[PDB]
Design a protein around this ligand. Structure first.
Ligand SMILES: C=Cc1ccc(-c2ccc(C(=O)NCC(C)C)cc2C(=O)O)c(CNc2ccc(C(=N)N)cn2)c1
Ligand SMILES: C[C@@H]1O[C@@H](O)[C@@H](O)[C@H](O)[C@@H]1O
Ligand SMILES: OC[C@H]1OC[C@@H](O)[C@@H](O)[C@H]1O
Ligand SMILES: [Ca+2]
Ligand SMILES: [Ca+2]
Ligand SMILES: [Ca+2]
Ligand SMILES: [Ca+2]
Ligand SMILES: [Ca+2]
Ligand SMILES: [Ca+2]
Ligand SMILES: [Ca+2]
Ligand SMILES: [Ca+2]
Ligand SMILES: [Ca+2]
Lengths: 75, 142, 116, 254
């Protein structure tokens, strides 16, 4: 498997979408998002898409700073 | 749009562009300023990406430049509100709402369990102590 | 642990793009004209209801108005403009959402144009 | 513990103090009335296997109160894969000759199931580590139990954020980093074998064991802990095992 790359933030009026590469070939993805001191929250579980809507997580506190991570899983 | 005998009609942005559909020259051709023309042409010729009604499950679309934004109903999320939040009750998702242990079951609802010393409540997700001193609890604070 | 990659940091309030606004209306009150900007709703919800961009930014947000031989600009701390106009002349309008304190992505795209 | 605070009496009820011939050896974690989880390296230089004592309900080493309970250690179980002098598989399961009595000051920490620990507890940011270890890299040990809050890091980040060091031990799948790299807080020598406890929806669980690290609170480094989730099956089977003649038992792993 290969790690996702080119993670990009796409956000307008807070509708926030994380996008990445590349198209999944025999592997799925799962995204996790967190605030500097908060726990990691999982989203878009084992999706085959190359984007993930994180809107519902960032609108909890628009002034916070978030970090996301894209995991690659085989199969 | 122009079809001889509507040419006689004097310039009209309303007519013109709103009205019928116009060309850049035609906006030219009304605004004069370059500047001013592009300003108008920026949105006018960008198209309504919402025409394809991309927002699903009762979502609302809001056009943008070369894109759109979907406002989803509470039980949905995703670029196009395609994601059903109700279909996400799995253990990897915040432990499946389980207080202690979570067990996934394809074809059926996930199930919650508890550590020795505790028992599952009727709410199907909470664990309560079955002994005086269960593990993982601090007496002097309880 | 699986293979993964971290994303750049993201601070919504400071980086989210401002959406395209739309001129709700415009009327004449003698020699002046009022230009009202539609409330731009966001994904932020305040207990079952989408908050407007102003609900979120408050004073951090202003709206700029372009009207018209160059252009004439006007700015407001609200969603309304009250400009002076010459009688018998038809003006055109265009608004833009702005967050002055931002160094980048400080402005939204212009709204569609509307003329008297 | 470096940069931590005193653990209020009774608030670190699962903390265990191990003694060999009466002297402070290492920390440990009580998981039920007869079993204590500690670190394998703590027994590298042990020669008198019958002089091993576990103290529960301890707080202030300078004085004794009615909350302290001592139990002779009847068996020390370590993975046969563990190599003395090294850092991998740094875990030990201890059997108390007689169970301790659970009280307001003596309570076991919950040993979690493997999956719950890997997909849920592993993502809870902060966890608590404690002990009577050194207060400073080369300093003296603590008289009163010290506790500290530390954030967990996935190995990849730990490696990318740590200052490259000559022949540093590899961070295996049986370990995980936690702490700060700014030289302000970290567990330390003497805290080894102690708990890295994670709080989750009203219950605490054992997720790590103080194991090793570059000095203590050294800029560019993180404390390293034994990844308990990898030994759940191993621990359960052994706790159901029958006692043996000798104290030390090098048990096969997996
Ligand atoms: C894992 C192998 C290993 C073997 C021996 C020691 C060892 C060597 C020497 C002394 C010592 O000088 N005793 C003096 C006094 C305290 C009684 C104590 C220990 C120990 O077991 O703690 C350590 C050290 N362990 C750790 C644990 C966590 C950190 C961290 N920064 N998070 C750093 N070192 C590690
Ligand atoms: C969310 C979405 C508004 O938006 C309405 O157009 C929709 O019915 C729905 O409420
Ligand atoms: O109009 C734009 C939209 O069209 C239809 C949607 O399904 C999606 O393709 C989006 O691009
Ligand atoms: Ca024409
Ligand atoms: Ca023509
Ligand atoms: Ca016609
Ligand atoms: Ca005409
Ligand atoms: Ca008309
Ligand atoms: Ca017409
Ligand atoms: Ca012409
Ligand atoms: Ca458009
Ligand atoms: Ca004492």
């Amino acid at each position: 498997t290969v790690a996702a790359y080119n993670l990009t933030w796409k956000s307008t009026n807070f509708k926030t979408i994380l996008e990445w590469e590349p198209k999944p070939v025999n592997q799925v993805y799962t995204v996790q998002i967190s605030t500097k001191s908060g726990d990691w929250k999982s989203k878009c579980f084992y999706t085959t898409d190359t984007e993930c809507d994180l809107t519902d997580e960032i609108v909890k506190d628009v002034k916070q700073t978030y970090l996301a991570r894209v995991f690659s899983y085989p199969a | 749009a122009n079809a001889f005998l509507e040419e006689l009609r004097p310039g009209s942005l309303e007519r013109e562009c709103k009205e019928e559909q116009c060309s850049f020259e035609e906006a030219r051709e009304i605004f004069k300023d370059a500047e001013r023309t592009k300003l108008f042409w920026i949105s006018y010729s960008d198209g309504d990406q919402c025409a394809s009604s991309p927002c699903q499950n009762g979502g609302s679309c809001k056009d943008q430049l070369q894109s759109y934004i979907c406002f989803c109903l509470p039980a949905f999320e995703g670029r196009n509100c395609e994601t059903h939040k109700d279909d996400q009750l799995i253990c990897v998702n915040e432990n499946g709402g389980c207080e202690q242990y979570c067990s996934d079951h394809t074809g059926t609802k996930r199930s919650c369990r508890c550590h020795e010393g505790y028992s599952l409540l009727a709410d199907g997700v909470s664990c309560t102590p079955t002994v005086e001193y269960p593990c993982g609890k601090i007496p002097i604070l309880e | 642990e699986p293979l993964y990659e971290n994303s750049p940091e993201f601070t919504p309030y400071l980086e989210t793009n401002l959406g395209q606004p739309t001129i709700q209306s415009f009327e004449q009150v003698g020699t002046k004209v009022n230009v009202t900007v539609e409330d731009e709703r966001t994904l932020v919800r305040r207990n079952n209801t989408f908050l407007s961009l102003r609900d979120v930014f408050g004073k951090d947000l202003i709206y700029t108005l372009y009207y018209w031989s160059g252009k004439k600009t006007a700015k407001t701390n609200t969603n309304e403009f009250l400009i002076d106009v010459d009688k018998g002349e038809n003006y055109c309008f265009s608004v833009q959402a702005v967050i002055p304190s931002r160094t980048v992505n400080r402005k939204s795209t212009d709204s569609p144009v509307e003329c008297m | 513990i470096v940069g931590g605070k005193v653990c209020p009496k009774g608030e670190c009820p699962w903390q265990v103090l191990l003694l060999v011939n009466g002297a402070q050896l290492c920390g440990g974690t009580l998981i039920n009335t007869i079993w204590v989880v500690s670190a394998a390296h703590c027994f590298d230089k042990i020669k008198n296997w019958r002089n091993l004592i576990a103290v529960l309900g301890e707080h202030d080493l300078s004085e004794h109160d009615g909350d302290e309970q001592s139990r002779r250690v009847a068996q020390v179980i370590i993975p046969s894969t563990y190599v003395p002098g090294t850092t991998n598989h740094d875990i030990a399961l201890l059997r108390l000759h007689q169970p301790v009595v659970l009280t307001d000051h003596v309570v076991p920490l919950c040993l979690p199931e493997r999956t719950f620990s890997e997909r849920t507890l592993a993502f809870v940011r902060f966890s608590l580590v404690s002990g009577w270890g050194q207060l400073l890299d080369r300093g003296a040990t603590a008289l009163e139990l010290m506790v500290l809050n530390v954030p967990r890091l996935m190995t990849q980040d730990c490696l990318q954020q740590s200052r490259k060091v000559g022949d540093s031990p590899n961070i295996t799948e049986y370990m995980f980093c936690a702490g700060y790299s700014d030289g302000s807080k970290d567990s330390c020598k003497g805290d080894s074998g102690g708990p890295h406890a994670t709080h989750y929806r009203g219950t605490w669980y054992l997720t790590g064991i103080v194991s090793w690290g570059q000095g203590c609170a050294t800029v560019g480094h993180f404390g390293v802990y034994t990844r308990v989730s990898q030994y759940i099956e191993w621990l359960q089977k052994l706790m159901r095992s029958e006692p043996r003649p000798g104290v030390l038992l090098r048990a096969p792993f997996p």
